[PDB]
UniProtKB/Swiss-Prot annotation, chain A:
The avian sarcoma virus 16 genome encodes an oncogene derived from PIK3CA. It comes from Homo sapiens. It is linked to PIK3CA mutations are involved in various type of cancer. Most of the cancer-associated mutations are missense mutations and map to one of the three hotspots: Glu-445; Glu-448 and His-921. Mutated isoforms participate in cellular transformation and tumorigenesis induced by oncogenic receptor tyrosine kinases (RTKs) and HRAS/KRAS. Interaction with HRAS/KRAS is required for Ras-driven tumor formation. Mutations increasing the lipid kinase activity are required for oncogenic signaling. The protein kinase activity may not be required for tumorigenesis. The lineage of its organism: Eukaryota, Metazoa, Chordata, Craniata, Vertebrata. Residues 655-925 form the PI3K/PI4K catalytic domain. GO terms for biological process: actin cytoskeleton organization; adipose tissue development; angiogenesis; anoikis; autosome genomic imprinting; cardiac muscle cell contraction; cardiac muscle contraction; cell migration. This is Phosphatidylinositol 4,5-bisphosphate 3-kinase catalytic subunit alpha isoform. Changing R83P: In CLAPO and MADAC; uncertain significance; somatic mutation in CLAPO and MADAC patients.
From Swiss-Prot, chain B:
It comes from Homo sapiens. Heterodimer of a regulatory subunit PIK3R1 and a p110 catalytic subunit (PIK3CA, PIK3CB or PIK3CD). Interacts (via SH2 domains) with CCDC88A/GIV (tyrosine-phosphorylated form); the interaction enables recruitment of PIK3R1 to the EGFR receptor, enhancing PI3K activity and cell migration. Interacts (via SH2 domain) with CSF1R (tyrosine phosphorylated). Interacts with PIK3R2; the interaction is dissociated in an insulin-dependent manner. The gene is PIK3R1. The chain holds residues 326 to 582 of 724 of the full protein. Residues 8-103 form the SH2 domain. Signal peptide: none annotated. The lineage of its organism: Eukaryota, Metazoa, Chordata, Craniata, Vertebrata. Polyubiquitinated in T-cells by CBLB; which does not promote proteasomal degradation but impairs association with CD28 and CD3Z upon T-cell activation. In adipose tissue, polyubiquitinated by the BCR(KBTBD2) E3 ubiquitin ligase complex; recognized by KBTBD2 through the SH2 domains, undergoes 'Lys-48'-linked polyubiquitination leading to its degradation. Binds to activated (phosphorylated) protein-Tyr kinases, through its SH2 domain, and acts as an adapter, mediating the association of the p110 catalytic unit to the plasma membrane. Necessary for the insulin-stimulated increase in glucose uptake and glycogen synthesis in insulin-sensitive tissues. Plays an important role in signaling in response to FGFR1, FGFR2, FGFR3, FGFR4, KITLG/SCF, KIT, PDGFRA and PDGFRB. Likewise, plays a role in ITGB2 signaling. The SH3 domain mediates the binding to CBLB, and to HIV-1 Nef. Coiled coil: none annotated. The modification Phosphotyrosine is found at Y121, Y234. This is Phosphatidylinositol 3-kinase regulatory subunit alpha.
Length: 930, 236
């Protein structure tokens, strides 16, 4: 507003406001010196405390997210993209440019480099590069099918249907499952040197076949083979898919182009820390009379020295200015030492706050000076006095208890020694126990006898690499010589499996070189499918790290900007926990980097976010239902976007009257979207998704993750006990999406609207040759799910949580909790309602050979899982700092080894299994072995 | 001198109880529990030192108990007393510790306290989000007040010459319109300032409530911890 005049429906497009302003300027003086309208830009303050301009004509004033009705008149794409990023992360971006912490700005400058290499690799082989990006293959973990269960194929060949749309001809062809799509297309041409490489989208969803590999190993074709369904494929040319994406490029932001030895081993002093005062501690004065501060030089869960405590003082004024000496030498400190501190209260032993102060910094310089840090609140249900596994760094929130400290003054340069001095330190200065400990689970007990055997025969541990997580819990990290030797070991340690290495990223291995080795092994040997399966854990290991930058984000961000599905799930996993302020800053910076380098896909996310935003608002008014939801806003918003559950499911035109909501205590959104595919008829007419709000879903995601892992292992070994690990994804604070499967019914509905009711229903569903197959499939599913629900200790369930398919499969939902809530191993109880079905209606069950086959197949599945339980142990260990009250500390993972009976032997575990399920059923178990 | 009468003997006990009892205790605390493997009674001692707990296993061969070869100790109690009254550095100097303190032997409240703990946690996590939102709103109001003030300053700096020329020419309707606009702007600024002051007062009250809520949580949590400890002691 160069003239400064202000005048005050108007929620239309900005053209109306521009015309009104021009009319006012023509009606009043001082407008003679105004320049061309194209040289003036409308800028104002949005609801997110950001000065931003407005070039978007498609969205009106009401979509600008303004808080007050005012407008001012003053590269463009740069801050347009900045506004888009701010929308895509839900919080203002430029608000981080005012942070006075040099670590934040250093990370912001440095992560853009990683974004640059990621997008450069994303645009390495144009135009095919971002083509493979935008729709990445959904392959299976196993490249090759098992050699002994390919008999499901008729003469080792699979029949498929290829469709051509002319605006609709199908071609049914039989091909070997280990054949590349080249021959698929070559023989598709016939029946109606030509090196065609055109896309074959799954009819009804955006899965595409690009790899020069066989057709069977895709997660969709394999499902069709195992389920017996007819695989239908439809042919496009390259031009349509290439013209679908209008191309995008990454640009450098504003802060992009802007540009002997002395060490810590030559100090002879003691780690003495001056605790000056706490600015304010939120503890009652008369109620609590004895408080103090506990500090420990932790390294993992290990207090390197005894936690030195301060004197107890009245709560009137907590000023000490007191030097506390810790029984630890300065040069013996490790690179990852952490002053874990907490104000605590004693009566006559419970903390009042907690916090961690790094004993170094990202510049590898020892902490030194006057240092006032705020403290986090006590985590829920954490009985331990300290929190060595908690988040690192400062508390960004300001209205929290703040402690003042002073650190020793040396008037020199403090730096942890370079690897060179340790490297050239030299040149101038039976196996039964090893195998038993290596094969033993990581959570197990350890003794100093075997610890000393490990340390003494460390040179023999290289032949057995899986022992690497065993040495670390053995060595004492407060000794420069032993730690130097361990660094030398880590440097030349051979890589281990992407699950054993993935064990080396827990909350118990904080050494920067150890976690660097673990992340290097991950990026070297983890596969895109395995990365997709374990992305939840790989995001949960960010919170354990000390600094904003680390080798972990260097890998996660590089992968999430090369695979659009992996990147989409990385986006949603990050964004799902913005509410937790502990890692809000770190993940918001990572989110800004992603949203800057994601590309055009950004707006897709925005659409998705927008939709969920509406739903989050819509689900907010749900606490006589369709008439209220009639504004064109949500028809315009809730259409034509990829689902978060799948970057391939276009949630198309909504059928408002079709979607109805039942009570079921809490009220989700059973929302059905039509499929906008030209021939969505073959796969599904519809796409139904349950939108849950108010309940957490991370534990359900983990449950489905481990269920799919178990099912894949069972398929690999030779037990065709097919599970139903459907899709689920939490999108924020206790809100998410759940898939709904095809042709499935809960047992309670059958009983209510239909005691042999289940048997009668399974009988009347089908007749003839497709009967015995139904009973066989029901047997397999029940056995697999019973073994699963016993091993993981899934809590109380009713008939409602159980559904049965038409073909015969049975499956479970509504995992309220698992691994118990502490203050009854298998209280689920298998009722005889299924026992009559498995016996084919016979009253007797003992004299049935089918029940014997069921029992032995259950036993084989259980003993198959018990020999792979190490992977599950590591998986449970990784997500400890993930915030679930049932996955806090390692003592909650014993439920995995208790039920799997890892302490006992195979046979003893067997009788434990039969005893448990015998106590469950009041009889009918503990039969003859084999 | 019998296993059952020994105070350090604890039988088949999982690590949860061992590590729960080995807390809020001085260095040099020990107890003996049956080995988890449960084969011919290997037994196992615990040894806290430097915070960390070290697990010791008492090997048994040819009717004889000892830490390791050579095997020259008859019973477990003999070795336990021998290393209770003598340092452990004779074989491995690293341990170099003396056994001083032994582990000596000696309902709706829990569920209720957990219920208020959960409800206070939920209230706290909602209050933190609403406090962040209010802080962002106040920051936005301050920023927009600053932007309005600087826009007014630059408007005056750019239009002072023309205003002076117009007022010296002899015109009066321009003076009236400037007075009207100035009064409207001043009223708007006063309203915004009053709203910001009221919002700041509300934020102060809400921060006081937040402090009180966290103080309640931190005062209540030790009671729940003690009740859980009592229930665990009574049941297991």
């Amino acid at each position: 507003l160069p003239n400064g005049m202000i005048v005050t429906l108007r929620e239309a497009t900005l053209i109306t406001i521009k015309h009104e302003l021009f009319k006012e300027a023509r009606k009043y003086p001082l407008h003679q010196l105004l320049q061309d309208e194209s040289s003036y830009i409308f800028v104002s303050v949005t609801q997110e405390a950001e000065r931003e301009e407005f070039f978007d004509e498609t969205r009106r004033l009401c979509d600008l997210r303004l808080f007050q009705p005012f407008l001012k008149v003053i590269n463009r794409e740069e801050k347009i993209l900045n506004r888009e990023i701010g929308f895509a992360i839900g919080m203002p971006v430029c608000e981080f440019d005012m942070v006075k912490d040099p670590e934040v700005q250093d990370f912001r400058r440095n992560i853009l480099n990683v974004c640059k290499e990621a997008v450069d690799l994303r645009d390495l082989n144009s135009p095919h590069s971002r083509a493979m990006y935008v729709y990445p293959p959904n392959v299976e973990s196993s490249p090759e099918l098992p050699k002994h269960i390919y008999n499901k194929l008729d003469k080792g060949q699979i029949i498929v249907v290829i469709w051509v749309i002319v605006s609709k001809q199908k071609y049914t062809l039989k091909i070997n499952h280990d054949c590349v799509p080249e021959q698929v297309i070559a023989e598709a041409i016939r029946k109606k040197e030509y090196q065609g490489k055109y896309i074959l989208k799954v009819c009804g969803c955006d899965e595409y076949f690009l790899e020069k590999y066989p057709l069977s190993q895709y997660k969709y074709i394999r499902s069709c083979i195992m389920l017996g369904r007819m695989p239908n494929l439809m042919l496009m040319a390259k031009e349509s898919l290439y013209s679908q994406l209008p191309m995008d490029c990454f640009t450098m932001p504003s802060y992009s182009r802007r540009i002997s030895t002395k060490s810590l081993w030559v100090i002879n002093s003691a780690l003495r820390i001056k605790i000056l005062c706490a600015t304010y501690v939120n503890v009652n004065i008369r109620d609590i009379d004895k408080i103090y501060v506990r500090t420990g030089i932790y390294h993992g869960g290990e207090p390197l020295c005894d936690n030195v405590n301060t004197q107890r003082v009245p709560c009137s004024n907590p000023r000490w200015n007191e030097w506390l000496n810790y029984d630890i030498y300065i040069p013996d400190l490790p690179r990852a030492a952490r002053l874990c501190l907490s104000i605590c209260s004693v009566k006559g032993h419970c903390p009042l706050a907690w916090g961690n102060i790094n004993l170094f910094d990202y510049t590898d310089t020892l902490v030194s000076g006057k240092m006032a840090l705020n403290l986090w609140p006590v985590p829920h249900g954490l009985e331990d006095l300290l929190n060595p596994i908690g988040v690192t760094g400062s508390n960004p929130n300001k209205e929290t208890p703040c402690l003042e400290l002073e650190f020793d003054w040396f008037s020199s340069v403090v730096k942890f020694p370079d690897m060179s001095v340790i490297e050239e330190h030299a040149n101038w200065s039976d196996k039964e126990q090893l195998k038993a400990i290596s094969t033993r689970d990581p959570l197990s007990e350890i003794t100093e006898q075997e610890k000393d055997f490990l340390w003494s025969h460390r040179h023999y541990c290289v032949t057995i690499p899986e022992i690497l997580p065993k040495l670390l819990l053995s060595v004492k990290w407060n000794s420069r010589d032993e730690v130097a030797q361990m660094y030398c070991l880590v440097k030349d340690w051979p890589p281990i499996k992407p699950e054993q290495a993935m064990e080396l990223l827990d909350c118990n291995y904080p050494d920067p070189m150890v976690r660097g080795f673990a992340v290097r092994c991950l990026e070297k040997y983890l596969t895109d499918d395995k990365l997709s399966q374990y992305l939840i854990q790989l995001v949960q290991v960010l919170k354990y790290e000390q600094y904003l930058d680390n080798l972990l984000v260097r890998f996660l961000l590089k992968k999430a900007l090369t695979n659009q599905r992996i990147g989409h799930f990385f986006f949603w996993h990050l964004k799902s926990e913005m509410h937790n302020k502990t890692v809000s800053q770190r993940f918001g910076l990572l989110l800004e980097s992603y949203c800057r380098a994601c590309g055009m896909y950004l707006k897709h996310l925005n659409r998705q976010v927008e939709a969920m935003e509406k739903l989050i608002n819509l689900t907010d008014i749900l606490k006589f239902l369709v008439e209220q939801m009639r504004r064109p806003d949500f028809m315009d918003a809730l259409q034509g976007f990829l689902s978060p559950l799948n970057p391939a499911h276009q949630l198309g035109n909504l059928r408002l009257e079709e979607c109805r909501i039942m009570s079921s205590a809490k009220r989700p959104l059973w929302l059905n979207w039509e499929n906008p595919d030209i021939m969505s008829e073959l796969l599904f007419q519809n796409n139904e998704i349950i939108f849950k709000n108010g309940d957490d879903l991370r534990q359900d995601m983990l449950t489905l993750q481990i269920i799919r892992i178990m099912e894949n292992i069972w398929q690999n070994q030779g037990l065709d006990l097919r599970m139903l690990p459907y899709g689920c994804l939490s999108i924020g604070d206790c809100v998410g999406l759940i898939e709904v499967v095809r042709n499935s019914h809960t047992i309670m509905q059958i009983q209510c609207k239909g005691s042999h009711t289940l048997h009668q229903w399974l009988k009347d569903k089908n007749k003839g040759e497709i009967y015995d197959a139904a009973i066989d499939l029901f047997t397999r599913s029940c056995a697999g799910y019973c073994v699963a629900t016993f091993i993981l200790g899934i809590g109380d369930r009713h008939n409602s949580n159980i559904m049965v398919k038409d073909d015969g499969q049975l499956f479970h939902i509504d995992f309220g909790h698992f691994l118990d809530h502490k203050k009854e191993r298998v209280p689920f109880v298998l009722t005889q309602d299924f026992l009559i079905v498995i016996s084919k209606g016979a009253q007797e069950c003992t004299k049935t050979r089918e029940f014997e086959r069921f029992q032995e197949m259950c036993y084989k599945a259980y003993l198959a899982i018990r020999q792979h339980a190490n992977l599950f142990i590591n998986l449970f260990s990784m997500m400890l700092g993930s915030g679930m009250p049932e996955l806090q500390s390692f003592d909650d993972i014993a439920y995995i080894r208790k039920t799997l009976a890892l302490d006992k032997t195979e046979q003893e575990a067997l009788e434990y299994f039969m005893k448990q399920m015998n106590d469950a059923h009041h009889g009918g178990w503990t039969t003859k072995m084999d | 001198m019998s296993l059952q009468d020994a105070e350090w003997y604890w039988g088949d006990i999982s690590r949860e109880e061992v590590n729960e009892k080995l807390r809020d205790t001085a260095d040099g605390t020990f107890l003996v529990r049956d080995a988890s493997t449960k084969m011919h009674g290997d037994y196992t001692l615990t040894l806290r030192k430097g915070g960390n707990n070290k697990l010791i296993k008492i090997f048994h061969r040819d009717g004889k108990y000892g830490f390791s070869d050579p095997l020259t100790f008859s019973s477990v109690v003999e070795l336990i007393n021998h290393y209770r009254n003598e340092s452990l550095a004779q074989y491995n100097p690293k341990l170099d510790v003396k056994l001083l303190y032994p582990v000596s032997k000696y309902n709706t409240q829990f569920q209720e306290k957990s219920r208020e703990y959960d409800r206070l946690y939920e209230e706290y996590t909602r209050t933190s989000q609403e406090i962040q939102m209010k802080r962002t709103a106040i920051e936005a109001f301050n920023e927009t007040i600053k932007i309005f003030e600087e826009q007014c300053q630059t408007q005056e700096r750019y239009s002072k010459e023309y205003i002076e020329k117009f007022k010296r020419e002899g015109n009066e309707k321009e003076i009236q319109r400037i007075m009207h606009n100035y009064d409207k702007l001043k009223s708007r600024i006063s309203e915004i300032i009053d709203s910001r002051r009221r919002l700041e007062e509300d934020l102060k009250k809400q921060a006081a409530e937040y402090r009180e809520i966290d103080k309640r949580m931190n005062s209540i949590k030790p009671d729940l911890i003690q009740l859980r400890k009592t229930r665990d002691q009574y049941l297991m």
